[PDB]
Ligand binder design. Structure first.
Ligand SMILES: [Mg+2]
Ligand SMILES: [Mg+2]
Lengths: 493, 492
């Protein structure tokens, strides 16, 4: 009996907003922002009835590069899309194409960000190459709107970022979930692969008023990693919101968005239970990247810090995954395709897979799983930092700062550098040798660009991003391309 | 046994630079520019040994839209790329994909213009989706550079617009022809489909000195269709005066065509030596033509015959009788259905907005003519639409009142017959068909709400800026271009 696959992805979602991750490091009611943190009962069910990954990271803490690595089993340079808005190479084979080729009905509902399509001020559905997704009716490339209006039935939709909900407006999280439930009912009696990518926790921290009412008046605490000018000891790749400008209204909005998400994940899980698909359906809860959310005095920033770099990875496969399993092995989005295809018995993406198939970690009987492994992450807009982690030690190399070594056992809040401590010399050496080796193997763009990285603490910063930029002539035809995309390619009539 | 397919396509190539088309309308040594016109012996061989199409037009007289229509059997709006630099829909099936599905080894050497990839100052090889093409090593998206230099063997090339020529420099036409022949030798004993798209005629008009010396000092005459500021009676959609005629540019254009024709001979000589002529279909065509000083215009995509018409010569010795002339009107939308019908290959699944007229080439008629009207569209601004039955050409526009052309009575297209009472019924039946086809093929002008004039009494009230969009610039493009040059398409 071929297992079904449902992947639920969020955008800019910090693991600290999930109770499953907060309980792993302490009380579920303690958070960087205190006790009024959002509770995630429905997502936490997947952890309780399955496996939680404590060291899952984005290949790059930016949307397009991470999403690309999740589909391809490849680092962002080999996907064609290391920067946002770049098209993913249409010739590359995705895990969805492998599922399609094994007789699976494939559907994507939500934000793609891999099609390279223009912004038309409204959701751009069916964007770019299918990449193995048969139903892309409710797949749109990019947008931060919170409300949708349905002008024509298929997917002719007007989008709105803010404002009260007008009479025919639907909150996007509910809409996309409602659409996914419909496709799930149609394919419940066949091998099906559904991916719902919800964009809500993302940047425009604007939430539904029925969710905001529950958080706007509550009290929140500024994260203890927040800085003041005289207490700023952060690396320069992270030097912004000082403790004085911590915004509790934006925090309440983010918490309200996460509750809408968890409620809507529950409707998907309630459906599976009612239609008896829980046992033979693999459910994954994940995100493209996380959010600093005022931690380290940063917000919405692609950083090697845990809150931004780390992504939630919770998987429930009742048949082959024991409940309460914790996988501590370090992983990136490059590992998803080989691992998910191995777990489902499906053939691997042919040729180069720069990741590992660790389906054994979930299929074995060990309640706590850890393998000795190092993984590397990359910076998206400017490739200005690189990072390697073994689970406890995190090494950051940059053209904007001298090397930084973090110890999560001794300093979980990543507030101190241990690179120059002679007691950590062997660790630093091992981590630096691996980062350089992985940088060369996975074609780190910084090496091709010749960025001035500092591999020694004696080095000085000499970096102007302008020298590595290629100024570009503006296309005079784009004003007319935008018109034909709106009125001809994606018409509201 | 499955026939081979070789398609040779040029860029911005007027039919009047081909002697096959010049002899169908007058003397071969008679041109709008005089008797010093380029002679095209090798391309003329395909007309003599096969069929010539007297009324073949581009779907849109602009590169990306016409190229997309040729591959997909669809008008440019349905290809995803009605305008240049827009990418073709990667989900669409091409005739190459249908050939790949029937065992054909498929290859493209030259300019694609459908991948939507960025300009990197050098050729961008392997551009975007394969679209049924299995060898795209020498397929580059866009660029009209005259010389290539090979830094690293596969496809790592630096490009020159026109240099004093250094030792490593290879002229693009010869380079691309050299690579096609290398791929043709490797697949000669298997069913093969090769397309060679040469960008040469389309250009900043710069030819190799070996070919330019043959034309730079000769004498050329300004076309009689040229106008002065005081004798201009052209439609406003076409509004280079005489005296701004550039014979040096013309010489460069003719020298470019002679290099092309010589290089087509090498492909034809290869087929003859390897005995592949009889079971290989060879097609010579172009995306669109060039006004080349005719109607006092040079490179503008217009409904005039020099821009709108495309060369279409086809030789299949097994099924096509030598000397055939097909006068049925066609657009590039018709190629895929017809080529697949001719090769006995499954038609592209789903909607085809064109016809499979392989019977016209296979039949016993030396002069084929069936009643049909076809339509062409304007690429950048959808400002004009055209319909033709072969003799009468109707142009509708937002910049001018309706224009009816009679190519029997006025082959130089200088007069309007729409408001001639003898042509009232023909104009009415032509306009009805244009509007019917415009609605059927989703003409963008109707969707944009452009102010098209459907009566001679109408007045032009059109502001293009009212229909154009506001475009914010992308901050990331500077860094994306660096990644493309150093990571995606490196010279090292
Ligand atoms: Mg982002
Ligand atoms: Mg052009």
């Amino acid at each position: 009996e071929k297992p079904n696959l449902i992947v639920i992805q969020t955008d800019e979602h910090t693991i600290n907003t999930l109770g499953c991750y907060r309980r792993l490091v302490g009380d579920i009611n303690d958070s960087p922002w205190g006790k009024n943190v959002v509770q995630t009962p429905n997502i936490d069910r997947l952890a309780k009835e399955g496996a939680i990954c404590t060291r899952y990271y984005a290949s790059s803490p930016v949307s397009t590069p991470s999403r690309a690595s999740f589909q391809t089993g490849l680092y962002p340079v080999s996907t064609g899309c290391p920067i946002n808005d770049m098209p993913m190479n249409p010739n590359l084979i995705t895990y969805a194409e492998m599922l399609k080729r094994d007789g699976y009905q494939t559907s994507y509902v939500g934000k793609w960000h891999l099609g390279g399509v223009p912004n038309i001020g409204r959701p751009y559905f069916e964007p770019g190459y299918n990449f193995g997704y048969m139903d892309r009716t409710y797949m749109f490339n990019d947008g931060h709107w919170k409300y949708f209006e349905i002008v024509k039935q298929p997917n002719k939709i007007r989008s709105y970022w803010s404002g009260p909900v007008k009479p025919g407006f639907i909150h996007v999280t509910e809409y996309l979930t409602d659409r996914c439930l419909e496709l799930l009912e149609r394919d419940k009696n066949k091998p099906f692969y559904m991916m719902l990518s919800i964009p809500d926790p993302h940047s425009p921290d604007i939430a539904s008023e029925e969710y905001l009412q529950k958080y706007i008046n509550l009290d929140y605490e500024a994260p203890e990693t927040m800085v003041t000018n005289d207490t700023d000891q952060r690396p320069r790749w992270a030097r912004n919101v000082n403790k004085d400008k911590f915004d509790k209204k934006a925090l309440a909005n983010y918490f309200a968005m996460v509750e809408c998400v968890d409620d809507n994940v529950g409707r998907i899980l309630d459906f599976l239970d009612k239609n008896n698909l829980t046992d033979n359906t693999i459910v994954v809860f994940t995100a493209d990247h996380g959010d600093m959310l005022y931690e380290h005095s940063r917000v919405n920033k692609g950083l090697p810090y845990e809150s931004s770099a780390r992504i939630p990875f919770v998987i429930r496969y009742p048949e082959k995954i024991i409940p309460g399993k914790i996988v501590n092995t370090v992983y990136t989005c490059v590992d998803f395709a080989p691992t998910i295809l191995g777990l489902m018995g499906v053939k691997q993406i042919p040729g180069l897979q720069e990741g590992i198939n660790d389906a054994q970690a979930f299929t074995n009987k060990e309640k706590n799983v850890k393998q000795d492994r190092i993984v590397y992450t990359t910076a998206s807009p400017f490739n200005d930092w690189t990072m390697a982690t073994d689970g406890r030690y995190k090494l950051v190399l940059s053209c904007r700062e001298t090397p930084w070594l973090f110890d999560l056992e001794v300093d979980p809040d990543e507030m101190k550098n241990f690179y120059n401590n002679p007691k950590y010399k062997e660790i630093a050496d091992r981590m630096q040798k691996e980062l350089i080796r992985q940088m060369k193997l996975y074609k780190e763009p910084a090496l091709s660009i010749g960025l001035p990285y500092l591999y020694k603490s004696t080095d000085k910063v000499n970096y102007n991003p302008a020298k590595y930029k290629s100024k570009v002539q503006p296309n005079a035809l784009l004003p007319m391309i935008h018109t034909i995309e709106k009125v001809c390619m994606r018409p509201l009539k």
